[PDB]
Every structure is written in C-alpha cells, then in structure tokens.
Design a protein around this ligand. Structure first.
Ligand SMILES: [Mg+2]
Ligand SMILES: [Mg+2]
Ligand SMILES: [Zn+2]
Ligand SMILES: [Zn+2]
Lengths: 577, 577
C-alpha cells in the first residue's frame, strides 16, 4: 500500500481528496504541469515554488535521448529536474498514437522508470483514437490489458492503469472493470485528447461516466491530456481527481492566452481579463512587442496561474456545496460545453449515489438546467409520499408545491429562485407533524413511528428544535438545514422501528469497542452498510448482531464505505456507552 | 464643451467610450472608488497608481469639517488628496437619505464645489427610497428638479444631474426627459443602493431601462452606488458607463471578500479563487492571522483588483462582440441576477435600437436565454417575409428553418449550437437570388427592386461577390458576414427605390461639399437620420433636398447620429463627386 487516497470533502460526484504516494502528500483535485526535459519553458523548481507539487514528464523522450537518459540514470529524475514533489511519468504513449509505434518494450520502459526513481509510473497502454474501427479498439485494448498484467507482476512502484476503450462505451466499462480488479493505484482515462481539442465535450462526458460507473470508487481518476481550465469544473463534477497540462506551455509558444472560458490569441486581446503576476503588471500591447522567449515565458506563467486559480475555484465551490452552480456558469463558455453539461445531467442514477444529502449552500435556481440537478430530482421523488400523506401543500418557486411540513427542510427552505419562498412555521399542534414528515423524508418510509409520541420544542422563533419524549432528547431539528440530528435515544428508536439493514453501518469486532466510546468509524473496519446511505446522512453504527453501537453522520455512500480502506466512514456523534 | 464623450466601440446597448474633462481623459466603462476624507483604507495616491484615474468623495462631509474645509479651500481637493486624476464629488445628499436633512443649501454646496476645484460636481437631488408612496416620489422629484434648475443657471463646472423617481418607471421617464433637456454633462441613476444591497436586480433593470429610454444617448450614464463586480456586465449591457464603489473598503472592514459571482466571508474561505497581488502571495488562514488593520487593507486591495479585472473582462468582451455571452455567464451567479437577466431580454425594443447590424463573433447558443438575444429576435423577424417569398427552407439549430438564400448571411452562417449548421452554397441560377434575399433582409422591404437585372459573380469558390449591371458595380457581398457593401451606383438605385427617409443621413450645407468628395461624415453635421438605421448599416448620405451626396457605413444608430456632437457618424465609402 504505497498509495493512500481518502475523501476530505465532496459535492456532486466530485471530491477533494488526500493523496499520499510513498510519503508525499497532495490534495486533489490537482493538475500536473507537463515538463519537456529537452526544452523547459518554466523550470520544475519554479513550478514547485508556484505550488505545483506534482508534475509529469515523458520517460520515453528521456530514454531515447543520450544526454537525458544518462543524466537521469546518474542523478535520478528528481535531482535531474531539481524537483522534490511527486514526479509522474508518461510512457511516450502520445508517440504511440501520433506515430502509431514506439521503439521500446513494455518491460523495458517500466524497468527504466524504476531505475530513475519515478514516483508514479505507467506501462505501454495504447491510446486508441476516437471513432476507431471497433475491431481496432478491441485488439488494442486486449494488448493494453495484456501489458497491464505484465506490469502488475513486475511493478515495484505505484502505477497508472489507463482506461482505453476508444469511443465505445461498452469497451470503457470492460476496461474499467478489468483494471479495477487488478492492483494499480490510479486509473487515468485515455484517448480523450483528440476530443478535447475538438471541443467534443459531450463525447468526453459519456466516456468518463461510462468509465466511472465500472471503476472502484476508491482510486484516483486522471483525465489524461485535459489541461485547459474550461473543463475543470465539469470534469471534477463527474469524479475526475487529476489533470495534466502541456497546453500552458504549448499555447504560450503559439501566443495563445488561457481563460476559464476558453482561449484568446494575443493579437485579439485589448485587455488582460486577469490579475495574476503577469497580467497585473503588463498589458497585451506590451507583450505583443516583447522578445519571443519573454512573451512565451510570461504567457506560460499566466496560463499556469489561470489553471491554478480555476482549481482553487472548483475546490472552494465544493467546500461550500456550489460546484453545480460553477459548472452551470462554465457551461456558458461554449455551445459544445453547454451540450456536454446537459448530457451530464442525464446521468442522474450515477450522480445521485454520491450527491450529499445536505449542503452548506442554499439551492440556487439559476437556469433551466438547475431544475435537473441531482438534489432537485431526489427531493421531488422523495417528497411525493410525504405530500400525499400530510397534505397541506404550499406553493414553491422550484418544486411547485410541497407540504408545509417540509417547508423548513433542505432544499425546500434552503433554496432561492426568481421569487422568494415563504417559510411555513409550525403551530404548537403542528410541531410534531413537522418532525414526522422530516423523518419520513430523511430516513424513509415508516421512520415517523420513531417520533410519533414525541414532544417538539419551539424556539424564540416558531422554529422546531429539540424533540423529546418521556425522558431525554431523541433528536434535534437543525437550524441550518431543517434536517434531524439524531440523539442516541433517537437512534435506538429508529433501530427498532426500521428493519435491518436500513441506515446501518456494520463494523468489525476490532472497531466495535471504539464505536461504543463515540470514536469515529474508519472505512477499513466497515464490513457492510445500507446501499441507500448517502453522504452526510444520519447513520446507525452497528455490529454483526445488529446491536446499536453509536449514531453518527456518513461521509461516504453506503457502497463507498465498503470499498474504501482509508479515511473516515462516519463522524460519530455519540456511542451507546 | 466642459465634458466630451465619444463611443470608441460597442456591443448591445453597451459601449466603450472616451470621456474627457478638464483636459483629463478616461475610458469607460469606468469605476470610481469612493474615498472618505476622514478614513482612507487605501490612499488616492495609491488608487491613482493602481490605474483608478477617477474618484468620488463627499463634498458635504468635507464642507462640514473645519480642518478638511480649510485645507479644501486652501489647496483645493486635488492637492488636498494628493490626487491628480478626475475628481467627482457627491453633493452629500447621501445623508439626505440616511437622515432626511442636511445643513447647507443647494446653492451653497454648489458654490463650494466650484471653489475647491472639483472636476465634476452635483446638486442636492433627493434619493427617494425604492418602494415609496407615489406622493413622496413625486414630491421629492419636483424638489430635485427645482434644485436642478438653480444648478443649471449657476453652474460653472461639469455636473451630474441625477434621475430620481423611486420605483415608478413613468417618474424615471419624466425625470430623464426633463434633465436630458437641461444642460448637464452626466446622468447618474439614483435610488438604487437599497435595491442592489437587497439583490433586487430586476427592479434595477426596469429603473435603468426606463431612464435610458428617455435620456440623450450622448451623455454618460452612472449607476450610482453600484460598486460590486457582480452587476458590471449586466449594467454595461444596458448602457451604463460609470460606477462608484465604497463597498471594496466597507466589505474589507467586515472581512468580506468580493468575487465576480458574489461575496464570501473570510472565515468561510479555504482557498482564494483569485490570482491578484494579494491572493497570489497569501492564503486565507494567513489573512486571518493578521491584525485587523493589515487584514482590511489587503482585503480592500483584493476587492479593487477583482473590480479592475471584471471591468477589463467586460471591455474585452465588448471588443470581441461577446458581451451577451459574458452577461449570460454572470447571470448564473445568483437567482436574482438570473431573474434580472431574463427581464432585461424582455426589453427587446430598447436593446434592439443599439444592437449593431453585424458582428465579428459568431452567434452561439449557450442557453435558452441566448435564443432571445436581440440579434436573434431581429433576424427572426426580418426573415419571415424573405422565407415566405423565396422558400427554399433549410434546418437551423437556432432559428429552426430559414431560406437557403439567407444561409450565407449573419447571424445564420456563423451560427453555432450543440449541432453545427451546414450552409448551402449558391448555384448559377441562384447567384442573383441570394443577393435579392439579402437586400430585402439588409435594406428592408422593396430593396430587391434595386437588384433585379443584376449579375452576381462567384469567387474562386462558389460564393456570391461583386454585383454589377451593364458593367457597373451595384454592391459586393462581404466574405465575413454575407452582407452587401454598397457601391455609389447601388446607392443611387436604392435612393430612388426606397422612399425618404429610409437609409438617409441628412447633413449640413457646411458638410455637403466634404461629403461629395467622399470625406467621412461627423455627427455634429448630421441634422437628421432614419431612426431605422443601426450601427454598421449601409447608409445614403444626403442633403436636405434628399440629393444623394455619397454612400457609407454608419458607426452609430440614426437616433444617436442626431444627438451626438463628437465623433464620426458615417464612414464614407465613396462620394458622388
Ligand atoms: Mg471498507
Ligand atoms: Mg449630430
Ligand atoms: Zn494573467
Ligand atoms: Zn485577490
């Protein structure tokens, strides 16, 4: 286990993760600048200074070059490039698509990668171009899978296992399934380079989602060749964790300027819509007249800053739970992105499994597409049985009509549209009705039985808070999202009321004592869990005999808790002891 | 002659202009930082170094403070603030809103502004709040106007004449009509501060457009108190040229961070989604660790950088003819802004009057709202007669179905959506057929009669080009937009085929000679022009007797040509002499 990966935060199917490779730690989503050993526009040392803790280079180019090859063997890639972060390596696979062939065996490049001290290696996977004859895509893929088995047996370092089914969805699923069962640490998605350059984003969405549906959720995903900011938000929303970019340098060399919305030619620029170290001091009409080498240098730096800024923008949106809003915003950059964005939203089944049950940010109605965001379809389908039983519906700016009993709950109350939605406060007779509808909504059918005879306390405001019954608190309605925070006594009631495995997270015998003490539950000790659990749901921590150990909040979906071997599964509120 | 204003570029009702006062020149859209004499988070000297060549301060506050007053009358505000840029001053009436009364007469503050050497002054207009009783809005408006009457008579400096009719569109219209007829140089739109803070952007749109519809188009428009980048694109697309910001500093004092999409709290930020001099060197946590004073300063600078960047982004978009795309992207920042964006598009009549006839940028469908952009509504309306006459309909992603005879013309050709649009090239028997559809489309009903017995030659490829009759050049279909560039001969036939005033720009007797030679027509010599003329249209230069003097292309709409007294109105292609 040289590679560890755990989720720290999430929104949509994307996530902020902690990746550790043999002692070197980085936070994802991250982007790795591609560096040309033969001609470095920006020094690896400067890239590291700028905050890029992971870079990538072509091991084949180094291998085929005497001076490079020799220096690499003499000092190791780190000292040769004078870089101390994570150094990933490409197997010149781009020359395998560009030139159809490569002069080196699978075993040889892998061995060379070990000799120069690479942090993350690769093997000779074949990047089948888009729309290739199916026969080709199949043949190349089998060769890729065969080379993958050899690499698995020979590798002594963490390695990428690229998914390569060309534009055939069934092949992507096949490749993804086979590689997931093998032991590699990262799964890049290949063959998308030509699609991105062609702005065929919708084809990229189908290849990425088809790949993610068949991949183990616990391994980092790398969109190979995706080095332009315009796709960051969309890609991260689908679960992509890593990006690589040679475009920052190549665009700079062709006098091209990156923006989060696309690309501009220096000659078409009258102003720099940027405030980075370059754009905050220079002007387009100045740069245009400077020496080639200086112009290339400054454009490359600018490109790197925009890249860095978009990633930080995506991560901050995830933290506040507004990634979908950013994606919607970015989709307006180009018709082809808009098309891809709409296609992505069609994959509701996939996205729904990872969409947090609650978010810090309010639901924003800012387009026709936002009405198709996962949280909206989930809320609509869930509120149905509730509206039917409790009636007393009220007009809603987004959902049309929702029972007044769910009018204080996310995303009904915590949403905003063109017109304001009026919160419907409880009566001292209604109070318990709110808690019951919420329980039904949040915990599912029959869950209201756990709170039937409870007493609901109302604050200074007519807002429901503490839910108590003949003794102590069973739960509390959160001020921020109108959902229930379970108390231990409340977890006991839901445990007897709902049939195993509902809301359950079953842990090892080893972890059982810790849970009883209120300590958090780590995914490695989770042997089983309810498939319906979603990130941030209230959950019942239990042992194999289904004996209550504690109650807490999930950080992963039920299914994820089973697969993940690192990171926390549940943030425990209280243990039975 | 105290204030000069000329349009340098435009898109939608938006424009980049050159504003000159006291010899000092500035490009708009421009934002003026609000500097407080008693408190300056950032010094004007520093603001001037950051490129802010125009600022605004409160004259009342200065006038009512002994020290400040002494220094003011002593050195003049310019030297008192160590600022050598354009200094505008707020009549202090902002206290007349927060307190209802000030101790100084309209006449007094006006003479005090003259004395301290202010570049742009103001009189005491009353900022009636958003939803005031009509009686109040009417009362305060008449007081405001009487004060404007006094100012107009005593004025010895360029002055702001603020439109002030609360939320009553008819009052705004009345206010604009009145002040517009008086001799003032700039028209701020007041009473919108409470709306902006409450994010009631839709109401601001209606107030702004009602005002703009009745204002002389040749005068700058200042959205008073609109100091947050979130509304820049939207406001500029409505024809707003100036903004003023106190927020950059006020937010900073309360640990608030501006973004083009909204505002964040420093304590709620994990990453800085920015690359400015501040966010480029520090992290959020490093910002919190700092003492309140240093922290405020850095946040203020960041806010100023985002403001400066958004303004450059807006101007760069105008320049490439993609303002609507940027507006569409920004409307996703918040439900209320999205709402306001949809409301703005309903004001088609106003927007269409200034929408250029052709653009360098292609028509992109990036949302449902883009289907309602001015250029789309217009081309759709103008095509109906052409389609129902020439038939030969084809499929179009955006317009659905259009005559193949218009398929080569903007915005049909360059158009692009999720699906590309295949353009139909002319045959040998359609060459003239295309020219006729275009003319009926470009010049309006009957225009085809000017091109019946004409011949159309196809370029190396199969594209219609120079049109002739018996060896005389009538027109030439351009290659970049598929529109006709009229020949002095084609103009002659159009002149007789189309009834006055269609396509006419009537000039002076003093300009008549220059026109005949073929010299460009300047606005101040144009006495009348067809209201139907749009920027970049082909126009017939004529004298009062409707005698053709030349042909050319308009830079302004007909209405604008009349009121403007600066800049070129027509780019003469050729004179009759
Ligand atoms: Mg597990
Ligand atoms: Mg004129
Ligand atoms: Zn830059
Ligand atoms: Zn910043």
């Amino acid at each position: 286990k040289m590679l560890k990966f755990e989720i720290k935060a999430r929104d949509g199917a994307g996530r902020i993760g902690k990746l550790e490779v043999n002692g070197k730690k980085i936070e994802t989503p991250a982007i790795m600048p591609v560096v040309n050993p033969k001609q470095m526009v920006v020094e690896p040392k400067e890239l590291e200074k700028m905050g890029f803790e992971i870079i990538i280079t072509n091991s084949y180019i180094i291998y085929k070059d005497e001076e490079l090859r020799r220096k690499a063997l003499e000092l190791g890639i780190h000292r040769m490039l004078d870089y101390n972060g994570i150094i990933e390596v490409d197997s010149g696979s781009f020359q395998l698509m560009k030139y159809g062939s490569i002069e080196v065996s699978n075993r040889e490049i892998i061995e060379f990668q070990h000799r120069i001290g690479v942090d993350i290696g690769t093997f000779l996977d074949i990047p089948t171009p888009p729309d290739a004859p199916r026969e080709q895509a199949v043949k190349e893929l089998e060769i890729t899978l065969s080379r993958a088995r050899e690499a698995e047996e020979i590798k002594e370092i963490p390695m990428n296992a690229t998914i390569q089914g060309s534009t055939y969805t069934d092949l992507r699923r096949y490749a993804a399934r086979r590689l997931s069962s093998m032991n590699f640490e990262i799964h890049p998605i290949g063959g998308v380079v030509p699609l991105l350059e062609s702005y065929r984003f919708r084809d990229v969405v189908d290849i990425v989602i088809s790949s993610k549906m068949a991949l183990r959720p616990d391994r980092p995903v790398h969109l190979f060749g995706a080095g332009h900011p315009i796709v960051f938000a969309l890609a991260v929303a689908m679960g992509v964790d890593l990006f690589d970019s040679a475009s920052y340098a190549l665009y700079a060399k062709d006098d091209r300027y990156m923006t989060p919305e696309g690309t501009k030619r220096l000659d078409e620029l009258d102003y720099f819509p940027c405030s980075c170290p370059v754009c905050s001091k220079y002007t387009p009409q100045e740069l245009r007249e400077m020496p080639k080498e200086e112009r290339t240098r400054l454009l490359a730096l600018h490109n790197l800053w925009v890249i860095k800024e978009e990633i930080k923008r995506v991560k901050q949106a995830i933290k506040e739970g507004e990634l979908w809003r950013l994606v919607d915003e970015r989709a307006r950059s180009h018709p082809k992105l808009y098309s891809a964005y709409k296609r992505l939203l069609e994959h509701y089944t996939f996205l729904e499994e990872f969409e947090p049950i609650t978010k810090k940010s309010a639901l924003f109605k800012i387009s026709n597409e936002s009405l198709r965001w996962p949280v909206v379809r989930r809320a609509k389908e869930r509120a149905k049985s509730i509206n039917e039983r409790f009636g007393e519906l009220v007009e809603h700016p987004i959902f049309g009509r929702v029972s007044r009993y769910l009018s204080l709950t996310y995303p009904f109350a915590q949403s905003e549209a063109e017109d304001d939605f009026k919160i419907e406060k409880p009566t001292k007779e209604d109070a318990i009705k709110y808690v019951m509808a919420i329980a039904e909504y949040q915990f599912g059918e029959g869950a209201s039985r756990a709170f039937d005879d409870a007493k609901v306390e109302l604050s200074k405001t007519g807002m429901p808070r503490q839910v108590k019954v003949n003794g102590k608190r069973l739960a509390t309605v959160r001020a921020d999202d109108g959902l229930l925070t379970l108390g231990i006594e409340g977890a006991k009631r839901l445990h007897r009321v709902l049939p195993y495995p509902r809301m359950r997270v079953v842990v090892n015998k080893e972890a059982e004592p810790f849970a009883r003490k209120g300590k958090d539950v780590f995914a490695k000790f989770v042997i089983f869990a309810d498939p319906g659990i979603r990130p941030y749901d209230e959950v019942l921590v239990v042992n194999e005999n289904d004996e209550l150990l504690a109650t807490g909040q999930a950080l992963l979906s039920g299914r994820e808790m089973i697969v993940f071997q690192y990171g926390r599964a549940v943030k425990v509120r209280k243990g039975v002891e």
